[model samples]
Target: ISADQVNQIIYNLHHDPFEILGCHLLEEGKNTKKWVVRAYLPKAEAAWVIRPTERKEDPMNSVHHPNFFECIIETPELNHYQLKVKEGEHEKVIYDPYAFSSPYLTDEDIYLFSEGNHHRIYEKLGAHVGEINGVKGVYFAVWAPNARNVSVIGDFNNWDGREHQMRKRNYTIWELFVPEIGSGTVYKYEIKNSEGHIYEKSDPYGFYREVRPNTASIVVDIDNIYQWHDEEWLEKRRNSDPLKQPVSVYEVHLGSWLHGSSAEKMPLLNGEADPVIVSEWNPGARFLSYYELAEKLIPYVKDMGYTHIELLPIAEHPFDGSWGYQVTGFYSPTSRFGRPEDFMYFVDKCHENGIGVILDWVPGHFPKDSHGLAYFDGTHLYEHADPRIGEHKEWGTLVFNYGRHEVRNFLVANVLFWFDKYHVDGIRVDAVASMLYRNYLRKEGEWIANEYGGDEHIEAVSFIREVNTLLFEYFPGILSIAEESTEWEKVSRPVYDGGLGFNLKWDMGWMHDMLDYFNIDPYFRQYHQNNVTFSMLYYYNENFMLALSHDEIVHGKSNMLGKMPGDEWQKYANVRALFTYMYTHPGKKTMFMSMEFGQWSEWNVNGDLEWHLLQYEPHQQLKQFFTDLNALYQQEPALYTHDFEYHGFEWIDCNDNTHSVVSFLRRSDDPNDSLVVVCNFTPQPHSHYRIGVPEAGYYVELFNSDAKQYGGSNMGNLGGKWADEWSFHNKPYSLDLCLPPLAVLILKLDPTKVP
Candidate 1:
């Protein structure tokens, strides 16, 4: 109902139906704040029904003894009075109070309101609205410009919206106040035409949007009264240092990965998760609770030389199937699994374990249905006015206005809140390509452009800068990752350079190039040299990552191991060799969950990582090899030291036809570490493979793709020695090494360690 109708409803009351008066927005002292609230009558009007919940009551029959005729509220500076009428108490309401509202503002639909112009009842104003106990009253209001009648209906009143109408107003506004009627009450309005046809409606400026099949305005007082404990936590967390280690990410999705199995009970919380339920040894107990995961995964990651835990977004959202993308509440975590503090405890526990927690974030769009942030504050406050940019063309959702200052504040505050209040270590922005460009999919004229030689979505760029400025200034160690895939330049550049301030940008170019090459039939990859060459070219100027991410396995794409058109043994060899190449290649690396174990199918969180397949297939060998590879990667400086440095790499042989080989030497200026990498793309065993070595001494094998650790047939060479004696083919004496089919080898010729 509109605010005007509320005034008429209260003035029409000859005798008060309630003993107390409560207004949603009532500021203290000299000013008359905006009288925007939705109120309804109790048992006298049973026009609405509520869901089956633990808390329910008949508001009219629930009156208390000592019928209070007047209420006096003492404020910090002044006293407020509410007097209940005793003249004609049983009179039925007559006029409709909210006929000025649009049909889209009905109780059944969802709406979004921007944080800027919407109800600004935070700490600045002293107005508070929320739940109270054992009190009841009918709130009424009016906004009838062309309306004939308006009435109040609610769960308490059986939602008979037409029965409790307000009287005509002289000031074109109506207001009804009830002191006993408290918060958490659900209500709606009924608007009737001049012909007397009435329909139930919802408030356009409602603060809370409930889920469908439950159409009612939640009577919430502004949430500015509670004493928060996060301030100290925020201060301590902001000042805390990032752990001294290299950054690596382990993507974790909490829902399906934990309890999607048919045999497993849903991943429900019982205060704290049990250790027995999340044991590291038992296959049945592999489900790691938030605590157990920190306890178990953090040390393992630390041992593996990783510093970050890049978890999937933990924002409170509904439709678990969307994997936390469709958010319903901006501040509160989803209560489906546990309380908000419990989730906070999970993040806190991760920080305590010395592993930075990187949360995946999505701020581009919001869902359209109820229980979402839409039509809030009765207008499109957080979105652009034009439908082209405001409406997400592909996802069928509403996009946000990154240009608005208050909207920018909302997003920026959210980022800080995660970093500060929750003690999170970093944020990985998801789908940045969508956020960065306006012509993300639609045609030139079909879409709107922001006038920066691209689409007209530069507002997102400005918002990103503001957020980045705050983050770098406040949390220096907190990392920002960009998922921009479409060759957006300066993605990892500093914010002052007119670039998006991100510490790392996912090298989607390299991933796509490598995936295209790997997807080819193993027997026919000789025809796809373009993929390899293009990948190497792109990595020169960009800090790249070769990723076998979850995107590769969805939408009818075959599994990694199954993508090869070879025998099962050949497939294992091909996949393992690809991993070896990725590890040895001059870039960082990532793989999906199932790829570690050589799962023959796409990942379905309903099951564990194919433990049963390990018992039968040689693919299990691939996983161990990967684990060992990671172990060696942690130990070898040649593998990671040259990263983020110029002149750290040089190609020794890029073009080789007979051996199908690509050899390279990567060295850091740091005299203590230098590395030599030799790879053979062809599936051929070689003996006494003469390869160039950096220094003349005993070279220790740091990594071997054929080392039986990754399920390869063991045709490995032992220790190799190089002498500075003979010169062959205008080259100095090199080490004689053994090479295997589609295998990669890394050796450390540490001259400093030698003497």
Candidate 2:
């Protein structure tokens, strides 16, 4: 070896140590070559080479450097071997990790990773325990381009960074193979940044993690550990289109959904009161194991008639208050629930029970925990160095450096990791608006404009488009949704059409308008009637999902039932009407966990949901109404088939602002399938309300929110009404019906009868 190469190796700055250190063929005799093995065993008294092919041992000499040793073996062909080392009096045998000359990552893998286009980079990087040439070992790899030195420190090496310094490869990738240290091994990366500061950080690509409050990456064998039993469901999903199908989602926070043991007591927070009977019920009251949720939540979602269950972020995090938003482990399921395999069981059970699962994913920014991705590798390698664009001042977090190729690769691969490892059906991207705009939640001069001197974050926008494109390309059946609250047009459109390319976008505008209208007193609802009617103006703007999300019920915002301005009876009635209107509108649907039962209090992250409320008649009746409503929504093709087009909806009478009422018709591609919906906002029932109809036939009452079973006044038009030949509102026929107070009526036209 050259003098410079030796100096570099001794100084621990060499990029490729395998080239000179591992077993190599050396020319000795005429047309003959002998295998030579070299190693750097610091502080070792003596060392020997043991060939596994034949039981032969040969001593190694302390060549030039005292720590450097070499041995010439009689084995003409290079093969697997072991190293015996003696430090003073103790001698131990271990497989020479560097003796194996197998390359872990291919050239194409490195090239794609460096270009930020590697959709499955997680498979290549991270601690992978496998057998190479029949020798069991753990192959460790990480990206630390700006680090001057990197090492794998774990229990096997007594957490000494100097013991397993990694070999830097092309594109700043550092890798090392440590034999006999396989799965379940705890490890971390010790890095020396360019600024000369050393820091130990968790693996960004680890498939599992040590429980929170303990920051360490655990070596996990994600493949072949658990088999899935949802192949039939997956095949159906692959062949179906979610947009054209019914998608009623039940959003839940797993930690607070239901506790495993009744022994778990939840203390009331300041100003937060528990139910009347139980004064101590809250989240962290006790969290259910993933297995318990599989047994409980999956069946509950199925019974409720919902097509899917959307979970709040379940990724590993340090703080429970963040609700899993401040993520530390991008690839790990939170240990708060159960082991990694347990989460897989939860997903598998959901699919088997015919309920799809959606996970909330946050790629906007991350918290500033010392052991997390923030300031990783002792430098701002994951985040941008410039505070103006990198810092999320409002959230007290750091934004990712989407402009960096490796950072983009890390995030893009993480999104796919959940799909490959845990069969997640969809990802609901959180805070997409925050990532799209540069000036989001920032005052003038607090943010930096893009290269074009505009408010758009060009790099983040590009990253979002690329991620969406990659997801659809690889997993076409999986859904990509965006919780974007901006006027960004065509958010759910395809990327080739110059759009963001999400499959669905949360209709924040509709939620705001509907809530504003519902909060108004019935006496003044006439003046603000446009609040509920305005959504139809832009109904077909994009593929929207009308969501009454957890955000609307937290942070002092009242719960869905509490937002209505009315007495007890009117409150329940208004909630039913609002939900009926939301389902009939031109969009898919989603509601938070407690809203279905008329939960009066806002969501408390620290407390359990008001599950005990179901014992009362009002809550029970409301929940039954939700169940029946979801059933109707799923069974009726007109409710979801053409949700994104104007052809699906037609105005019957939107000008009934005087009585605080509105009527409309929803239709499917089949002309015979149609339903007319009438919403009454006031508490005054009308006995003869005339509504326009397409034909003269018997209009069967499919559902009525004012039914006696749903905690209403029991006012309605018997079962249904018959349309007369008299024309009204420019239609050929009209039906004079009894409109109940603060309720909605859904009527289906009889296709078997003539006009």
Candidate 3:
């Protein structure tokens, strides 16, 4: 070999190390062929090439450099071989990493990856530990089209980037097969860009990572030892339609839901012990393992009648303050709780308990961590080059270039990875409104427009549609929910209809308006009555989820209960009435933790919730009320059957502004099975309040927010009221009702009338 060739391989500048380092066929003598083996062992005192089956060792001679070694054997072709190295009184045998060839990645795989349509790109790119040609090792691959050289560096080679340079293929992918290196190996990619600068980066498709404050990716076999028992759940999910069924989600932050010693005991209040003390409150808290949560959280969700649990972002992240939003490992479940298998256990348990699990997925932006995807390969490969469009100034993060097909492939495949690997039932996409507009939080000229000079982010729209289309095609039963805060038309419509193609969108307008209306003083509620009645005007525009999520209760905004504008008694009553109204409204429902039990303070991500509040009677009663409300919502077909249709709801008293009162009727496909909802917004009792009813049978008060069991004033109709034959409000019957202050009433006609 030439001196320059040896120098290039030694200096880690060679694109294909297999040419210079591994076995090569050679012509030895008269019509004779032999094999020459080469290797570089910097710390080896001596080295030998050995055949595994023959149990024979041939000593190699020092050549080219003191670290370089070579040997000639009378063999026709290269097969499986091992390296025996002696260094400083230590000798070890290892399978030669460079002896195996990287199987060709099909032309279709490359084309689809470049086009951003490869749904299984994740399986091909990351560090995978497997056996090739009867030799066990880790196969490492990364996408660094702009890099001049890429190498694997980790504990195997004393963390030197020059030791294991990879073979660049297709001008984009770099791959290497390192034998004798299997699972539990720690590694990272050392990339040399066109600028001649070397940068270390974690594998973008890594399935597991070192815990935070440490950035190296771990070699793990994700397909190991996971026995899923949710085949029945998955089957049902594939055949069910979420829009027509009851979907009440309980949003939880796993880090704060229950932590440390709290896992030892149930988090429910028993009135005998101080909950804070019993929960083992600590200043700096520790998180619960997925097994602990499976044991505690799943049963609680089932008992509370919630159909699904929406987890805050659990993707591997560096900063706990970001709460998993600024993800570094998109393919890895955060190691904060446990390994990938532990997370799988958590999901499997939820499904076994008849509850679904939803993940909060963030693909809009990524943090500028030095070791993450920002300026990866020493170029703007994953983000745009223009500052006007590439940066999210408010978040201090970099926006993804959705127009880049490779970037889009990374994101779309990431969504599928969760559902396929972790058994996740849905994804609540975060910051979708920001992704939908060019000037989201930017001033006019601070952002760029599309080719048509419009504010809409055309590329992002296309990417979103593609994701929804692929998700539906692959996993029809899983949901794609958008946390979009704009009136982006047809967000939940099919892509063939020129829509973004999500299954559901958060009702941000309804949340804001309802909170605004509830915060107004009772006397002045008459002027702003439209806030309560305005949502129905556009309720059917999309499949919506009425979410009181973690976003509303943080950043100085009060907790849901604290947002009520009144005395203690009035506050409890107001929230009861509000929840009653929300459940009866025309949308799916999701509520953040602590809100169901009247928490008085804003949510704290670093600490446990105020379980101590449950010791109070009012909070306990509120908890009971929420539990029953969820039960009623799931049990009654009328409440959820036609949530997105105008035919399902009829307003009987929308114009009752003078008294701050309104009533509505919710109907199912069978009109006889219907419910009447009446809400009184003011803190004043009204006797002999007449409400019209469609049926002339007994009107049973099925649920009343004013009931004494729920910390109310104990004032309500005596069980129920009989509708008289007098016609009112275009109905054939009317009933005299006792309307309690700041309360809601739900009435249903006696079933005996139908039979």
Candidate 4:
């Protein structure tokens, strides 16, 4: 019977929903046609079809099924009609969602996606705000290739899968258009597999999401909202070379920089964060929003003279304790601080202040949250099936299947999405060593090797090279930093040369050596002098960034100030000497938050920094010392210009274990431009120190770590010293000078020798 056919559509078992729902014209006579309008409203008691030209109410009659209603009309009514539904005592008219459909994805989108060449796949596979046939609505899409049924579930449809099942396109993507639901619509995909297993997951390519503990993806048109005002900054960046310029990064965590966890976070008005008096023990302290960071953070970085801000991972995650390493939403900015637009505002403000922004990106692993990309479609769709190759036993997260084309495309597009939407200068890829090695954190025979029987993951290595090549091709003068901690060769080289194709690599070896050397007592430091001078043996292996990162100061690893083996006064002097040594070194520089001011406690992810420590004189002087080093690092081209070449750095005297001292020279492109750095690690001040200089000229003290202003003992040379033309340490000139206790001194050729 005809009623039996309508019952199949109402029972959620229909094959092609477009065949039974919406308006369809039926030819009855030789030249006559009747338009039958059908709608499935299970919650409504009555329904009617209203057209603008009809000027009357056309009633819809229910078939044998109480929820199956149809209206038979003579014409199509200009292809526009409304459905007025009554539920109990309420009645309201709305646009019929089944009536709106269009060609959402072009043919090339699917072709390129299958071939894994769609770097702009972010454009096609997410929820978008669009209009079709003069009707405005939100278009939703998801990728669940093996699912038997996929539906767009939202508040408008009472969050029921039966109300709006999506149409499968190309047998890979599920798409649907819900009219009258514009931006700000909260939605998720309800997927039913062949075995009748069902799961609800957030959109992988969603631009925004709900705050923590509530994981629904939100509809947002970041393209249409927020006009950027940093055009000048971008233009200059495109024409500049970052490696040739000064690169000093200050790593920061947004929420814990000045407040507590997302559980107590609250949104702030624009410019509200600048004037607040926030303390670590403030009552019910909260996280600052993006707008608040723009007002306060940008100003502070600019004043301190750091050229770049390397943010911890900003992507959406389910747990705050992961520090953004375990990600769920690849395309969403975390809602802990604010919406996607507010984060854009913060980036724009940083650019306007002459500060570059580098966001941390993690592609290593993700948590197994049920609502995330875990066991999606009742299968291991986004991850590997073999537990040995798929699981991170140490962290309890699932590894991504880089061998699959779809997964690679999803991650490749994500890297481009941040640069295209947020206008950041670079991306610091986290955990590159974890992605490269198959036996990472695994025991013998616990992991599978490559086809060549090696421990390297070749598929992931090739995927990384492809991503790096595409980003450099699309965006000029942008950086791709690899947070690799192994002996991987040519990590910062180009792909054409058989390399991993990153722009810079973090030097964890140098950081570990420096910290371990400084922790030794002065008498014992003489035995481990190689620990300080060993970094110079291979400093130019890759374009390295000497980073004192957040990972070193958390989870029971003591803070920088606490790592010094001395009393309070000696602790302050030791750190000051280390900062001066780092500034004049060959690599670029990066320091974690609160290290500049010498915070004494291990970092707390849920509390604010020790801002009250500024009242103490040692912390104030430590911060001032770092600020001056930053100014000097930027002012002298010798500190940065040729960081990647071996000739840029030369050791003058490295075998001074008896005095526990080392001297080196930092050279720029020009032979005439050079600066010599001298470091004395022990507490004993030497009165008449002799070292080699490359050129014969008057040497002036450009910077001294033991100056009285820095709360030191104030031991230094008078003002300047003349170099004598004599052979010393294989150099043509020598300088006999006074060196300070536990300090570093930087000297350059004085222009006016008559003084």
Q: Under the 3 Å rule for N, CA and C atoms, how many clashes does model 4 have?
A: 0
Local accuracy of candidate 4 as per-residue lDDT tens digits, 503-576: 99988889999999999998899999998889878777788888999999997889998889888888988999
Best by TM-score: 4
Estimate TM-scores for all models.
0.67, 0.83, 0.83, 0.84
TM-score of 1: 0.67
Root mean square deviation (Cα) for candidate 4 = 15.5
Off by over 4 Å in 2: 1-103, 262-284, 753-755
Residues 1-755, candidate 2, lDDT per residue (tens digit)?
Answer: 66677667778999888887968787766555687888888888799986533446799987777777889875444444667777776565555768435537767678878888666677669988766666889888998877889999999999997979998988488998888987789999998888888889898888778767788999888775677887667657765789999999999988777654435432221111121121144322456667767878888889889999999999888877888899988888886776677789899999899899999998888999988898776678889998788988878999999989999988888887787678889999888988999889999878878888899999999999988886765555778888887789889999989889899999998999999998999989889888987877876778999999999998888998888987899989889999999999889899999999988899887667888899899999999999999999999999999998788988899898889989999999887788999999999999999998998789988899999998988899887888988899899999999999999999998767654
Better of 3 and 4 by TM-score: 4
lDDT of 4: 0.84
lDDT of 3 by residue, 405-516 (tens): 8999999889988987888999998879888988889997688787898899888998898888877766667888998777779988898898889989999999999999
Kindly indicate the candidate among 1 and 3 with the higher TM-score. Answer: 3
lDDT accuracy of residue 74 in candidate 1: 24
- Tell me the lDDT of model 4 at 213: 72
